[PDB]
């Protein structure tokens, strides 16, 4: 009841959407032969819809006056399952490929054709940066505390004034 939202178990228009979609499929099903491959596609389309409604009825979600579930983020740990754990699930894997490109380029740029191995990327070093990417939240702490996550501003190309 975070903004007057009523839960989806006792949301009356949310349970109305389940009586409105299969009836449209029932109009699609009354006219056919009920053993045809349309009808095995018409019994599936009810039940794939059903377990979605029985996912959000059971999740304790907060549906609105439209009859549709909304998402809450101020993050409390009653509504942590809307944003937080699906959100940091992005963050872990984003630094994985982030510490791929942070780690692939420092070695390969110390080569003779340092740019063709950006074109023809070596399958050794890339799968290493897959393994080196898994240690991304821990490894960059001794980078910045030593200072090798940044540079000094006398090393970086900087537009004139």
């Amino acid at each position: 009841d975070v903004a007057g939202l009523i839960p989806c178990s006792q949301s009356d228009a949310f349970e109305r959407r389940l009586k409105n979609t299969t009836q449209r499929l029932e109009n699609r099903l009354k006219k056919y032969e009920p053993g045809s491959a349309p009808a095995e596609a018409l019994q599936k389309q009810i039940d794939k819809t059903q377990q979605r409604f029985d996912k959000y009825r059971n999740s304790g979600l907060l549906c609105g006056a439209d009859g549709l579930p909304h998402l809450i983020t101020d993050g409390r740990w009653s509504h942590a399952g809307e944003f937080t754990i699906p959100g940091l699930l992005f963050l872990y894997i984003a630094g994985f490929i982030g510490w791929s490109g942070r780690s692939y380029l420092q070695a390969v740029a110390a080569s003779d054709n340092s740019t063709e191995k950006e074109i023809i990327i070596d399958i050794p070093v890339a799968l290493q940066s897959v393994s080196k990417g898994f240690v991304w939240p821990l490894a960059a702490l001794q980078e910045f505390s030593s200072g090798k996550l940044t540079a000094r501003d006398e090393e970086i190309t900087i537009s004139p004034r």
Partner: peptide, 11 residues
């Protein structure tokens, strides 16, 4: 399937 929409409340 309107129920699959992502609707964030302006909490």
């Amino acid at each position: 399937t309107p129920e699959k929409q992502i609707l964030i409340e302006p909490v």
